[PDB]
């Protein structure tokens, strides 16, 4: 199917509390496989999925070299952005970056990504063409110039169209029994009365993978979009996800409302009613 | 595998 590889970087300045901290996490779809944290006594890349533990010491030694380059680089990038915005050397600032590639169902580079943020706001992003940049303000236009001069988009296009895609495929084959095996959710409805007139009907979904799921409460056919209390998909802590949707319905009307569960691991979209 | 080229902003 449709798969992706993403790397998430976080570079924090901490005046007086040491040198900037750089952290990196890697993902194959919704599964984390690597981590790096410059704050460690012995900073080195560490596995966070079993299907990566098989990689040799050269692989880990290679990743650590890359993440050590980024620790040195982001210390300089944090000073420059502080200078662009005329910020004091006492404040703490954050540079975030998320980059990676998408494979289509046909298994070829679908689209590549490279986005950077400053203090939680868009800063600079690589455009869909993988040639040009979108800069958020005039400060990001200074970075844009530096990156145009250094031909960073050209570098990224080679990585995204090649090594990103080649290594993603490798991770998908080495971890096929978990990465290419979709987990269907575990559905069940619960009745919890809030008042004598009204009662809450929660539609639960547990132990599914990937995190993409669509839960809809339909009152005799029409979707109760404004009226449904939907919560954010949460991690179970064992590579799987959870999600629920609750509707406060009148005590007795419990059979007029139906919950539709849409997922990759399901053969057909489920329809659920409350079971007394 | 992460990108092994980094340019200061």
């Amino acid at each position, epitope marked *: 199917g449709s798969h992706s590889m993403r790397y998430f970087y976080t570079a924090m300045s901490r005046p007086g509390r040491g040198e900037p901290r750089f952290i990196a996490v890697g993902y194959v779809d919704d599964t984390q496989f690597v981590r790096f944290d410059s704050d460690a006594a012995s900073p080195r890349t560490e596995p966070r999925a079993p299907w990566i533990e098989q990689e040799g010491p050269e692989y880990w030694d*290679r990743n650590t070299q890359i993440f050590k380059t980024n620790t040195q680089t982001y210390r300089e990038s944090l000073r420059n952005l502080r200078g662009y915005y005329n910020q004091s050397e006492a404040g703490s600032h954050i540079i975030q970056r998320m980059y990676g590639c998408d494979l289509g169902p046909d298994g070829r580079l679908l689209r590549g990504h490279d986005q950077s943020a400053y203090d939680g706001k868009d800063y600079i992003a690589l455009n869909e063409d993988l040639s040009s940049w979108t800069a958020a303000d005039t400060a990001a236009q200074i970075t844009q110039r530096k990156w145009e001069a*250094a031909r960073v988009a050209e*570098q990224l296009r*080679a990585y995204l169209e090649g090594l990103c895609v080649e290594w993603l495929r490798r991770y998908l084959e080495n971890g096929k029994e978990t990465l290419q095996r979709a987990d269907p959710p575990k559905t069940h409805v619960t009745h919890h009365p809030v008042s004598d007139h009204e009662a809450t009907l929660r539609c639960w979904a547990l132990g599914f993978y990937p995190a993409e799921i669509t839960l809809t409460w339909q009152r005799d056919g029409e979707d109760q979009t404004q009226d449904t209390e939907l919560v954010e998909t949460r991690p179970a802590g064992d590579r799987t996800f959870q999600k629920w949707a609750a509707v406060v319905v009148p005590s007795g009307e419990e059979q007029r409302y139906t919950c539709h569960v849409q997922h990759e691991g399901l053969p057909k979209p489920l329809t659920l009613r409350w079971e007394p | 595998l992460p990108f092994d080229k980094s340019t200061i902003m």
Partner: T-cell receptor
Amino acid sequence: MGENVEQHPSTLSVQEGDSAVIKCTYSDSASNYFPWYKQELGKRPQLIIDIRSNVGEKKDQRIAVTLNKTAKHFSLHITETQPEDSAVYFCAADGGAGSYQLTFGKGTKLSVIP
Amino acid sequence: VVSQHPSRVICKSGTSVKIECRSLDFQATTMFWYRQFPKQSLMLMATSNEGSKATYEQGVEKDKFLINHASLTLSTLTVTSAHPEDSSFYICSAGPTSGRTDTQYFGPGTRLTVLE
């Protein structure tokens, strides 16, 4: 440091107006950047053209570079040679393990006989 | 663009000659030092890392060639107690991209002539 770039030929004589071809080979697969430098007598090496692993050919007027990442060899093609093209040409690759560096070829002395 | 200073040096044997390598319009975390004798090849001597110790190539005397990576813009090469065999063309390179070496820009080079 795990990359070896071999440049062939060591010397080249071509007639003004004819075409010159320099071939290079690389060892490491971590090589994704391949620059070409031209160095005139007593002067600095100047970047003339380069190619990346996602491109097979790149052309700039008379200068052209070819890449075959399967056989691990890349080439420089100068068409309609001018006597000003006479210089030492170096090719490089960014691959290898350990310490990061450009691994350069030993050089090609191009002599465009007018 | 990358530059050097001095461009040409004539000195007596036993003197230490300091050569600068400067990235005039960008910041460089790494600078490379080469030696070029009349044999045409570019011989990498050392890799200057900010603000780490220089990496020397095989058969390069770490004590004869002192490399200091002072700032994100300057690297100096010192030919300590230079002898006539140290007469060579010392050229440097730097590029705006850190990590796996990308586009490198060369300095004009330094022609060192050591005479007894």
